Amino acid sequence: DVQLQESGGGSVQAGGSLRLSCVVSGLTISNYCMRWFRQAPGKGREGVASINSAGTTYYADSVKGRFTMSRDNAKNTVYLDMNSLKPEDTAIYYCASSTRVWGGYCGGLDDATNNDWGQGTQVTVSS
């Protein structure tokens, strides 16, 4: 039974940084593509970052450089470090594992199929 629990969302001002956490239960996160998605207000859910079993990371065009994803295997937890946040980063950030893919590789960033999903965490970035 795969459970993902996000935390660390909050209000921050543009320029600032935040760190999100996603604690995973029922899977070893090293063996899967783990992912961050987000849904901005009124918008469809979008891919943000992902990390394959080799710990290689891929990032969406709009966040590359600024955002970084990593992994802590002893805690079975996945992080997103968001640096130089902008008003457009305001969204519910959701963590996911590509549970139903055989392989440790990642689908495309915007590939919301094959996943178990957490519940989301709110990030608000004021001007």
Author numbering: 1 to 82, 82A, 82B, 82C, 83 to 100, 100A, 100B, 100C, ...
Give passages from the manuscript.
VHHs correspond to the antigen-binding domain of heavy-chain only antibodies (hcAbs) that, besides conventional IgGs, occur in all members of the Camelidae. Notably, VHHs are characterized by long CDR3 loops (average of 17 amino acids (aa) in contrast to human HCDR3 with on average 12–13 aa in length), which is often a feature of bnAbs against HIV-1 and may allow penetration through the highly glycosylated surface of Env into conserved epitopes not accessible to conventional antibodies. Based on these favorable features of nanobodies, we aimed at selecting broadly neutralizing nanobodies against HIV-1 from dromedaries immunized with soluble trimeric gp140 SOSIP immunogens. Overall, we could select Env-specific nanobodies from 25 families, of which six nanobodies showed potent neutralization of primary heterologous Tier 2 HIV-1 strains from several subtypes in a standardized pseudovirus-based in vitro neutralization assay.
Crystal structures were determined so far for VHH-5 (2.3 Å resolution) and VHH-28 (1.15 Å resolution); for A6 no crystal structure is available yet. Both, VHH-5 and VHH-28, have a long CDR3 region that folds over to partially mask the face of the VH domain that would be involved in contacts with the VL domain in a typical Fab fragment. The CDR3 of VHH-28 (19 residues long; H93-H102) is two amino acids shorter than that of VHH-5 (21 residues). In both structures, CDR3 is tethered to the body of the VHH by a disulfide bond between residue H33, and H100C or H100B, in VHH-5 or VHH-28, respectively. CDR2 (H50-H58) is 9 residues long in VHH-5, and 10 residues long in VHH-28; however, the H52A insertion in VHH-28 is accommodated by a bulge in the loop around residues H60-H62, so that the CDR2’s are the same length at their tip, and both adopt the canonical structure H2–9A, with residues 52–55 forming a type-I β-turn in VHH-5, and 52, 52A, 53, 54 forming the same turn in VHH-28. Nanobody VHH-5 with intermediate breadth and potency was selected from library 54A-1, i.e. from the early library of the dromedary immunized with optC SOSIP. In contrast, VHH-33, VHH-1 and VHH-5 show lowest binding to optC SOSIP, but neutralize optC pseudovirus with an IC50 of 0.7–3.2 µg/ml and display intermediate neutralization breadth. VHH-5 showed lowest binding to optC SOSIP and intermediate binding to ZM197M SOSIP and consequently only showed competition with CD4 binders on ZM197M SOSIP. 3D reconstructions of ZM197M-VHH A6, 5, and 28, each resolved at ~25 Å, were used to dock in a high resolution model of BG505 SOSIP.664-PGV04 complex, which confirmed the presence of extra density at the CD4bs. Because of the small size of the VHHs and the low resolution of the EM 3D reconstructions, crystal structures of VHH-5 and 28 could not be independently docked into their respective EM density.
